[PDB]
């Protein structure tokens, strides 16, 4: 298992632009388009996105694509932020994969506002850091992804993706 594939699973993939849990305008492997509610914005974004007259669909190479920019963003995102780097840093392979989860989902910003299980995860204490990250609109509102990504920070294994 990997980011790509754990990410894969968490967001689906959908080659028409569709709205997401909060109902903005996304495309492929949670692509989101834009926050605005129009689908004619939304196919504006889409086309400058890959470059080309789209018309709301795309293919599988190019969801491929912006899925690849996306992981890659969000990593080097994380490897910018004062308060995320240091966590990072400091985590095991499969739970630096989790961080990354969350930053893709949440953007870095909203991550790092995460102050109390940031430190919590930096200290190690696994079950106190899931006590906490559940006290939180993201738990509250996509219960069953974020219950997948905290027993992943709580484990440091796989396991709720098998
Ligand atoms: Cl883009
Ligand atoms: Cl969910």
């Known amino acids: 298992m990997n980011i ?5 699973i968490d967001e689906g993939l959908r080659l028409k632009i569709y709205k997401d ?15 605005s509610p129009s689908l004619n914005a939304a196919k504006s974004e889409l086309d400058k996105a890959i470059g080309r007259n789209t018309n709301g669909v795309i293919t599988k190479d190019e969801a491929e694509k912006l899925f690849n ?22 985590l095991d392979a499969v739970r630096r994969a989790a961080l990354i989860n969350m930053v893709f989902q949440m953007g870095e910003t909203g991550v790092a506002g995460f102050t109390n299980s940031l430190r919590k995860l930096q200290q190690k204490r696994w079950d106190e850091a899931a006590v906490n990250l559940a006290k939180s609109r993201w738990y509250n509102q996509t219960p069953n992804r974020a219950k997948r990504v905290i027993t992943t920070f709580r484990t440091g294994t796989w396991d709720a993706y098998k």
């Open 4 to 8: 790509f594939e754990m990410l894969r």
């Open 21 to 35: 849990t909060e109902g903005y305008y996304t495309i492929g492997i949670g692509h989101l388009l834009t926050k």
């Open 69 to 90: 920019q996306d992981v890659d963003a969000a990593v080097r995102g994380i490897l910018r932020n004062a308060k995320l780097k240091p966590v990072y840093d400091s």
